[PDB]
Design an enzyme around this catalytic site. Structure first.
Site, mmCIF file in Angstrom:
data_model
loop_
_atom_site.group_PDB
_atom_site.id
_atom_site.type_symbol
_atom_site.label_atom_id
_atom_site.label_comp_id
_atom_site.label_asym_id
_atom_site.label_seq_id
_atom_site.Cartn_x
_atom_site.Cartn_y
_atom_site.Cartn_z
ATOM 1 N N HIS A 136 -11.460 6.914 -9.925
ATOM 2 C CA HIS A 136 -10.034 7.313 -9.905
ATOM 3 C C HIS A 136 -9.247 7.028 -11.240
ATOM 4 O O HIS A 136 -8.224 7.674 -11.520
ATOM 5 C CB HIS A 136 -9.299 6.598 -8.791
ATOM 6 C CG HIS A 136 -9.486 7.194 -7.418
ATOM 7 N ND1 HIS A 136 -9.117 8.490 -7.133
ATOM 8 C CD2 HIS A 136 -9.863 6.647 -6.240
ATOM 9 C CE1 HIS A 136 -9.302 8.739 -5.856
ATOM 10 N NE2 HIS A 136 -9.744 7.632 -5.289
ATOM 11 N N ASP A 183 -0.604 10.026 6.809
ATOM 12 C CA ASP A 183 -1.476 9.015 7.482
ATOM 13 C C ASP A 183 -2.125 9.545 8.797
ATOM 14 O O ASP A 183 -3.238 9.169 9.146
ATOM 15 C CB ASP A 183 -0.696 7.724 7.738
ATOM 16 C CG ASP A 183 -0.225 7.067 6.453
ATOM 17 O OD1 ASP A 183 -0.895 7.199 5.412
ATOM 18 O OD2 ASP A 183 0.803 6.379 6.491
ATOM 19 N N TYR A 192 -12.587 14.363 1.018
ATOM 20 C CA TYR A 192 -13.612 13.689 0.291
ATOM 21 C C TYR A 192 -14.911 14.469 0.278
ATOM 22 O O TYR A 192 -15.501 14.702 -0.793
ATOM 23 C CB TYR A 192 -13.919 12.322 0.894
ATOM 24 C CG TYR A 192 -12.758 11.322 0.852
ATOM 25 C CD1 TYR A 192 -11.733 11.370 1.790
ATOM 26 C CD2 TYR A 192 -12.756 10.301 -0.053
ATOM 27 C CE1 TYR A 192 -10.681 10.459 1.741
ATOM 28 C CE2 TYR A 192 -11.695 9.359 -0.121
ATOM 29 C CZ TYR A 192 -10.654 9.448 0.780
ATOM 30 O OH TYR A 192 -9.598 8.559 0.752
ATOM 31 N N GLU A 229 -7.035 2.471 -5.605
ATOM 32 C CA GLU A 229 -7.237 2.476 -7.095
ATOM 33 C C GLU A 229 -5.995 2.178 -7.918
ATOM 34 O O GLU A 229 -5.649 2.882 -8.924
ATOM 35 C CB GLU A 229 -7.733 3.883 -7.465
ATOM 36 C CG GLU A 229 -6.682 4.990 -7.284
ATOM 37 C CD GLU A 229 -6.757 5.758 -5.959
ATOM 38 O OE1 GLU A 229 -7.224 5.246 -4.907
ATOM 39 O OE2 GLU A 229 -6.268 6.913 -5.939
ATOM 40 N N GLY A 242 -10.865 0.683 2.419
ATOM 41 C CA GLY A 242 -11.982 0.114 1.665
ATOM 42 C C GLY A 242 -11.488 -0.321 0.291
ATOM 43 O O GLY A 242 -11.763 -1.452 -0.216
ATOM 44 N N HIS A 284 -16.211 4.057 -6.767
ATOM 45 C CA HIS A 284 -15.186 5.025 -6.343
ATOM 46 C C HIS A 284 -13.834 4.717 -6.987
ATOM 47 O O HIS A 284 -13.208 5.593 -7.604
ATOM 48 C CB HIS A 284 -15.123 5.106 -4.790
ATOM 49 C CG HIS A 284 -14.191 6.140 -4.277
ATOM 50 N ND1 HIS A 284 -12.828 5.942 -4.200
ATOM 51 C CD2 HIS A 284 -14.418 7.402 -3.841
ATOM 52 C CE1 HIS A 284 -12.258 7.031 -3.708
ATOM 53 N NE2 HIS A 284 -13.195 7.928 -3.490
ATOM 54 N N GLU A 285 -13.376 3.477 -6.875
ATOM 55 C CA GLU A 285 -12.079 3.163 -7.378
ATOM 56 C C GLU A 285 -12.061 3.291 -8.866
ATOM 57 O O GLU A 285 -11.109 3.763 -9.408
ATOM 58 C CB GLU A 285 -11.618 1.785 -6.912
ATOM 59 C CG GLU A 285 -11.628 1.601 -5.397
ATOM 60 C CD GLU A 285 -10.976 2.671 -4.557
ATOM 61 O OE1 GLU A 285 -10.005 3.306 -4.972
ATOM 62 O OE2 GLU A 285 -11.495 2.889 -3.407
ATOM 63 N N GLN A 320 0.872 -1.193 0.000
ATOM 64 C CA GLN A 320 0.000 0.000 0.000
ATOM 65 C C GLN A 320 0.913 1.250 0.000
ATOM 66 O O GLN A 320 1.523 1.600 1.022
ATOM 67 C CB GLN A 320 -0.945 -0.010 1.176
ATOM 68 C CG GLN A 320 -1.764 1.281 1.342
ATOM 69 C CD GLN A 320 -2.602 1.620 0.108
ATOM 70 O OE1 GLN A 320 -3.273 0.769 -0.456
ATOM 71 N NE2 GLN A 320 -2.590 2.880 -0.298
ATOM 72 N N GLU A 368 -9.663 13.145 -4.410
ATOM 73 C CA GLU A 368 -10.792 12.473 -3.740
ATOM 74 C C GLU A 368 -12.164 13.124 -3.958
ATOM 75 O O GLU A 368 -13.172 12.426 -4.115
ATOM 76 C CB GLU A 368 -10.514 12.278 -2.259
ATOM 77 C CG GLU A 368 -9.249 11.442 -1.997
ATOM 78 C CD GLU A 368 -9.246 10.054 -2.613
ATOM 79 O OE1 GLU A 368 -10.319 9.522 -2.855
ATOM 80 O OE2 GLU A 368 -8.116 9.489 -2.855
HETATM 81 C C1 B3N Z 1 -4.311 15.805 2.703
HETATM 82 N N1 B3N Z 1 -3.918 14.712 3.586
HETATM 83 C C2 B3N Z 1 -4.080 14.930 5.020
HETATM 84 C C3 B3N Z 1 -3.654 13.434 3.093
HETATM 85 C C4 B3N Z 1 -3.416 13.210 1.742
HETATM 86 C C5 B3N Z 1 -3.317 11.919 1.263
HETATM 87 C C6 B3N Z 1 -3.389 10.825 2.069
HETATM 88 C C7 B3N Z 1 -3.278 9.481 1.423
HETATM 89 O O1 B3N Z 1 -2.951 9.409 0.204
HETATM 90 N N2 B3N Z 1 -3.684 8.426 2.147
HETATM 91 C C8 B3N Z 1 -3.786 7.087 1.559
HETATM 92 C C9 B3N Z 1 -5.196 6.875 0.953
HETATM 93 C C10 B3N Z 1 -5.471 5.412 0.505
HETATM 94 C C11 B3N Z 1 -6.864 5.194 -0.057
HETATM 95 C C12 B3N Z 1 -8.035 5.650 0.812
HETATM 96 C C13 B3N Z 1 -9.347 5.127 0.212
HETATM 97 C C14 B3N Z 1 -9.609 5.796 -1.128
HETATM 98 O O2 B3N Z 1 -9.855 7.033 -1.322
HETATM 99 N N3 B3N Z 1 -9.606 4.958 -2.136
HETATM 100 O O3 B3N Z 1 -9.836 5.445 -3.403
HETATM 101 C C15 B3N Z 1 -3.587 11.022 3.429
HETATM 102 C C16 B3N Z 1 -3.773 12.320 3.920
HETATM 103 ZN ZN ZN Z 2 -10.195 7.446 -3.196
#
Ligand code: B3N
Ligand code: ZN
Ligand code: YB
Length: 607
Positions: free
Chosen positions: A296, A372, A380, A268, A265, A292-293, A131, A315
């Protein structure tokens, strides 16, 4: 400039391509091999450059057949260690070379979780998955770990022959490993340029089933049957998305259903979306994660945020696009139901973080902060709210969907900022500047808290959820007798979920109420992960001791952070469960995903 990367920025040089050749060794829990980066200079007289790394052991760096000099800087926490490479000849602008780095990952790579056989479904084989989003690619391989750079890639992955490797790429064949007949080499090609956060790898006892003309579902054997059912709408969703965003450019769209500890969840990864097995409800009601995916593939994978400060761009527009896919499948009233729910979720995040918290801004400043740690529903749902608001301001979904398609075409294959988006918005809607200029841009983009304006929502499918919730909230002891399983007769699984979310916003409720709720509805027996998560939060926040074992079990039998973190926190806030929550974390932490291990620890204020 990308405050989360230590590498040379794109103005200095750009990685155009990665050829990865590695071997997966489940004994030492390491990835070992060579990352050959084709790098283009963007400056005159370029003599050195810097890559991101995190807990990598570098064996050597080779350029035109000879070892060259390199040094690793001091670790900068979650940013890792910058690696400066001395080039053997100075490069002019646009000149490209190949840098071959031999390396090995650490067992503790924050990108990776290594699973023992008892952690898998099958029990006979171990399993590895990655990941990378946001900034964990550097913990697999040296790179400019920044979404402002896009590269293609090829790879060859050597694994025990009883296992299968997959990646975020087109499958290009397998062979026995020439060096080692107990091994197989799997081959991969990604012809479309991608940010390195989209590199992915899984190795395990995987099987496949075709579910659409350009979709196979992969999982361990135990989950294939349910997965093929659960995600059977995938092709219809892809056809809708194409209609909305233009051509699907990636060729394949496969799905991989991971083991229960996958932290999100969905993810992508191009050509191979990774999903949580907690999507497996038995009725397709959680397939919006797939929409959702899918989305993307345009918003994020094609047009990409230039730095993580602009994550909302990825997002918010994806949530916007997926709510359209849902609306095309099921109706506009459904699109409104989901949008209104997403507002509720935004309200929740703001109350949790607090209305002045800098991570409640839409555009954020990630200087010195682990993405993280700062991750939440805000980019979102505040992102989506902005877009839905603009949709209604500028004359509706059909008109705004023309903008969205044009925005995707305009910035395909690029990485952009919020100013690029806003500039193009004004350009497209030149004839409506007077309306745009009424938008409070500074508050929407840069203020904390709820947005300055709430869009308008159709209530049709939400009314029944609200009504049943308000009945329970306003009920006294002598009204409890009037509730009955017939109350749920006309609610869909989504409406049940929304009833629970409405009620949980007003938590705690009295304990006799929560008892009656189980007596009459048997929510304990529901397998739907979303519904069960909210039902269990309601029970714990309302101090029902009986729920403690159920909530502990749900927090640990799976590891999707969306469920695992709030459950461990609720359980830590309940005095009757506090110590057991702490001890259970302490017992499971060695075996958890490293990121989830880390955040749960912070949330529990332990270690
Ligand atoms: C602005 N900010 C505080 C952040 C920006 C990016 C992330 C991140 O990429 N995190 C990993 C996301 C993995 C997928 C999450 C589920 C999703 O949206 N799938 O499409 C974290 C925080
Ligand atoms: Zn996403
Ligand atoms: Yb020169």
């Amino acid at each position: 400039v990308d405050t989360c990367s230590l590498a040379s920025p794109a103005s200095v040089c750009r990685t155009k391509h990665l050829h990865l050749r590695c071997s997966v060794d489940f004994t030492r829990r390491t990835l070992t091999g060579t990352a050959a980066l084709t790098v283009q200079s963007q400056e005159d007289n370029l003599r050195s450059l810097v890559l991101d790394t995190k807990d990598l052991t570098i064996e050597k760096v080779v350029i035109n057949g000879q070892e060259v000099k390199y040094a690793l800087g001091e670790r900068q926490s979650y940013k890792g260690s910058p690696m400066e490479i001395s080039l053997p000849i100075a490069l002019s602008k646009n000149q490209e070379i190949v840098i071959e780095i031999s390396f090995e990952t650490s067992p503790k790579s924050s990108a990776l979780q290594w699973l023992t056989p008892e952690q898998t479904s099958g029990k006979e084989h171990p399993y590895l998955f990655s990941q990378c989003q946001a900034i964990h690619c550097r913990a697999i391989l040296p790179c400019q770990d920044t979404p402002s750079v896009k590269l293609t890639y090829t790879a060859e992955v050597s694994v025990p022959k009883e296992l299968v490797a997959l990646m975020s790429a087109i499958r290009d064949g397998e062979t026995p490993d020439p060096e080692d007949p107990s091994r197989k080499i799997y081959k991969f090609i990604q012809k479309v340029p991608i940010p390195c956060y989209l590199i992915a790898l899984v190795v395990g006892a995987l099987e496949s089933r075709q579910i659409g003309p350009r979709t196979l579902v992969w999982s361990e054997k135990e989950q294939v049957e349910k997965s093929a059912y659960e995600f059977s709408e995938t092709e219809s969703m892809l056809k809708i998305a194409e209609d909305l965003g233009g051509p699907y450019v990636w060729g394949q769209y496969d799905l991989l259903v991971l083991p229960p500890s996958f932290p999100y969840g969905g993810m992508e990864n191009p050509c191979l979306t990774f999903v949580t097995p907690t999507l497996l409800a038995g009725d397709k009601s959680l397939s919006n994660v797939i929409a959702h995916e899918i989305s993307h593939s345009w918003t994020g994978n094609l047009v990409t945020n230039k730095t993580w400060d602009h994550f909302w761009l990825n997002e918010g527009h994806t949530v916007y696009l997926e709510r359209h896919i849902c609306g095309r499948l099921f109706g506009e009233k459904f699109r409104h139901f989901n949008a209104l729910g997403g507002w509720g979720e935004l309200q929740n995040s703001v109350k949790t973080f607090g209305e002045t918290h800098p991570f409640t801004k839409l555009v954020v400043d990630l200087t010195d902060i682990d993405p993280d740690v700062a991750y939440s529903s805000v980019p979102y749902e505040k992102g989506f709210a902005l877009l839905f608001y603009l949709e209604q301001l500028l004359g509706g979904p059909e008109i705004f969907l023309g903008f969205l398609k044009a925005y995707v075409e305009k910035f395909s294959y690029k990485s952009i900022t919020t100013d690029d988006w806003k500039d193009f918005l004004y350009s497209y809607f030149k004839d409506k500047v007077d309306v745009l200029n009424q938008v409070d841009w500074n508050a929407w983009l840069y203020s904390p808290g709820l947005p300055p304006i709430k869009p308008n929502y159709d209530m049709t499918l939400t009314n029944a959820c609200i009504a049943l919730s308000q009945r329970w909230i306003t009920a006294k002891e002598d009204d409890l007798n009037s509730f009955n399983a017939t109350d749920l007769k006309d609610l869909s699984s989504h409406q049940l979920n929304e009833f629970l979310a409405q009620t949980l916003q007003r938590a705690p409720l009295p304990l006799g109420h929560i008892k009656r709720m189980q007596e009459v509805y048997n929510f304990n027996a529901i397998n739907n992960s979303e519904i069960r998560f909210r039902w269990l939060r309601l029970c714990i926040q309302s101090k029902w001791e009986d729920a403690i074992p159920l909530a502990l079990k749900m927090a640990t039998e799976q590891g999707r952070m969306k469920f695992t973190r709030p459950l461990f926190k609720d359980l830590a806030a309940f005095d009757k469960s506090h110590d057991q929550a702490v001890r259970t974390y302490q017992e499971h932490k060695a075996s958890m995903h490293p990121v989830t291990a880390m955040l749960v620890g912070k949330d529990l204020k332990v270690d």
